[PDB]
Symmetry: D2
Subunit: 212 residues, 4 copies
Amino acid sequence: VSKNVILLPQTNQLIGLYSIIRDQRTKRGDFVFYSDRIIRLLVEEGLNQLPVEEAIIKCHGGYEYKGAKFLGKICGVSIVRAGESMEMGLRDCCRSVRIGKILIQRDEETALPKLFYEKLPEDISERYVFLLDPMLATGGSAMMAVEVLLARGVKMDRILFLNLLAAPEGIKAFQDKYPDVKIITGGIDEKLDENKYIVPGLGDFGDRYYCI
Amino acid sequence: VSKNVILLPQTNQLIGLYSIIRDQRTKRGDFVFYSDRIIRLLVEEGLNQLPVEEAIIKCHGGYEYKGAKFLGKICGVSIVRAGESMEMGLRDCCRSVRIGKILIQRDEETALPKLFYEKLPEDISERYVFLLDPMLATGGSAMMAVEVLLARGVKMDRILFLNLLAAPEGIKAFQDKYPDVKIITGGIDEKLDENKYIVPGLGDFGDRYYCI
Amino acid sequence: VSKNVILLPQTNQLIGLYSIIRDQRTKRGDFVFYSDRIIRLLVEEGLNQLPVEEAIIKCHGGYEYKGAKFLGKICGVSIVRAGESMEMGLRDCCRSVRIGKILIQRDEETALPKLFYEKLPEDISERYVFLLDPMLATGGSAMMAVEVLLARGVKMDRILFLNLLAAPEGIKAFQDKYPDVKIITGGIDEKLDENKYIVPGLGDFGDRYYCI
Amino acid sequence: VSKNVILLPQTNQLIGLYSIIRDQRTKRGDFVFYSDRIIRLLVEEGLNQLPVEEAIIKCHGGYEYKGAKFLGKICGVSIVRAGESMEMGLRDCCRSVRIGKILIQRDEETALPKLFYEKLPEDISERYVFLLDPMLATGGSAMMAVEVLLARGVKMDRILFLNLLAAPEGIKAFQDKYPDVKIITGGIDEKLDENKYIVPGLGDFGDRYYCI
Ligand SMILES: O=c1ccn([C@@H]2O[C@H](COP(=O)(O)OP(=O)(O)OP(=O)(O)O)[C@@H](O)[C@H]2O)c(=O)[nH]1
Ligand SMILES: O=c1ccn([C@@H]2O[C@H](COP(=O)(O)OP(=O)(O)OP(=O)(O)O)[C@@H](O)[C@H]2O)c(=O)[nH]1
Ligand SMILES: O=c1ccn([C@@H]2O[C@H](COP(=O)(O)OP(=O)(O)OP(=O)(O)O)[C@@H](O)[C@H]2O)c(=O)[nH]1
Ligand SMILES: O=c1ccn([C@@H]2O[C@H](COP(=O)(O)OP(=O)(O)OP(=O)(O)O)[C@@H](O)[C@H]2O)c(=O)[nH]1
């Protein structure tokens, strides 16, 4: 696996878990539940990248524990309607965490990125940012969204891109443009299909999470 | 660490997380939230012990994925009122999982274990059992509860004891009596205090989770 | 309906909702989900009994709203293992609310109530107390638990007993002994069976929520 | 209150609850928690509008209960990024419910509504639709979204618009255009401000829920 691509440990349990959401017979309730469990694993892996400092912790009864304090401020940012699914996993790990939104698409007439919606913390330049997109297929949207974050002052080495599954094409595209962004993914699949879906993939993540 | 004691990886993030719940200044809302996050980490580690089989998974679009199917049926069993806190973490990982209850105490007059309450799945003898007790201090209650499970036909090597923190005294006592039970813990602390609390510990887990 | 018995409004939706959990074909996942939704309705009805004071609320932009502030401190107390199910509904309505536990049974030899476990807020005498027991059949356990609360200084008119279903026998027994305790219930059924289950009822609430 | 405007009962508890989220001193954690509790109240009120049929329910032990079955299929549809907050409340009441998305804005050049994103159930024409937008200020977005639903075959009298707060201006605009859509709201405030925020309102719902 390439530099700055962090793959969840491919345990027997993780493969069994991914097998549930991949299986085309898995219905929406189970698809949502188990996707949410995977999303929490991605968030935990991404949080393992953040810095800490040693700290003495006072425990009840007058005892001291040699512990640690978190040094990173965090927020999540979702980018397509499908990334919204990931917000709950993030908020189950990071209490009341801030979550922003970037909705950005190539302008059909000028072929340049164009922003449809933005909501970000006012101090986002001082934060680590978990970019939330469940499927890294081509990486088109995620690359446009990172450019917005960088324009808003976010440090390149404080952006972590969480996704359930990635294709090699998207990893390559994204890393060619943003080689210091860490990609946290739960699986790297084979290729894309002609509609740019990941293969073997899991069908349409957003449709399965929300509608079908 | 001894045989059949499985310690969560002691990452910077995990130490920072434990430091929140240990800190005597952490109030109930934060104590509950972050304990719940730790409990989910314990459940995920325990689930990594369960068996799988390879399985071809059919994915949308006619693709096949070489995946896996879970082979273990599971349930959780909590044992003191404090273990009840752990039920939500288990049910966030294992959809609608069965959860039993064993309330058992030494008879003050005969000094022999006496059962106050029991509710277990009718097929518990065919299941893996996550025994839920947040603090492994002396291990007294957990040992009595395991004896009940074994009397009900549960296989010794299908019992996994999840706890947030353990003392050496409790690990030794428990493993001397049930050496094939796996203990999944998030930290092993120094010793016990004269009221049999873990040191440095985190005060009274149940009081902090529920009442104070 | 008698004095101090507060019945949830028997809307078409509520009957449809109760019909899901009553139906013997409803499996555990659906039974848990819909019971939890009902439990939240019971908590909301019970919270409607608590006092408020008028208060001017400052809203963003320099506006004032004639609002209100809650005057009651609250906690929940569950009493049989089955009441534990209700804790999550209470904590989805009252953020990080304190929850106590009373486990009390008649002494088989002396026929007098005997306490197996107690954990209550140190200031419980100053709180409203939601007593949590899903089924008010005979009311035996709930009556013993109320006596403990009153011994601990809880005001009689600050105890609210939440239950999903009640039998007339239990309402009568409980109200004969504690006529100033409000009973909040979602349905009053016909009678008890010879094993003291409510009829037509919903089978064994605890078994269905947890084990079967 | 006008025809087809359904106001949550303005209980002491509801006013106390709204006072928490209105208060400009309420921080994000409390704002999210209590908004979510209100959103569930809106969903329950909206569900009370849906049809049922009488049904005999078989209960354990051979008993029959004269109950009811739901006749409406449902989905939610959110419309601005702020409506996404409401999805969790809906999914806590309606198990695994389908949720769609309509992102639609007036074309700046042609002044005609233009669709940026749509994801709806394939059978949405057969469903009741909970339109989710936390603040009914001008109603501009909600009116454009309803037109999309009607174009997709949704029945006018199966659309229910859930919002936490409404201004008279938005109620009037929306009802002038769609008089058979039911509006379920938790409060009707005084007027709009020059940036079209509700007064006295609660500031910027989306900013407070997510970012600030
Ligand atoms: O590495 C980390 C960093 C942070 N966190 C957790 O993420 C949560 C958000 O951590 P933040 O430090 O970003 O808080 P915030 O700025 O949004 O908070 P306020 O100003 O609104 O008070 C915090 O509870 C923290 O413990 C982790 O879990 N791991
Ligand atoms: O290793 C495992 C095993 C099981 N599980 C998950 O635990 C859940 C419970 O798995 P069980 O296999 O114990 O289901 P059950 O017997 O209680 O189910 P019913 O008979 O009521 O239908 C299942 O959704 C499974 O996917 C894991 O997550 N990991
Ligand atoms: O009528 C009420 C009263 C209280 N509540 C809600 O119940 C929650 C608990 O309200 P409490 O007032 O009991 O708080 P507490 O004493 O346990 O809090 P700390 O001392 O630990 O700080 C509070 O967030 C309150 O808003 C209601 O929702 N309705
Ligand atoms: O009035 C109602 C109607 C429905 N509901 C609840 O909303 C949930 C969704 O009810 P639906 O009937 O819309 O289910 P669905 O079509 O999406 O289900 P599948 O085809 O995927 O199997 C169901 O569990 C129902 O009980 C209510 O709570 N109240």
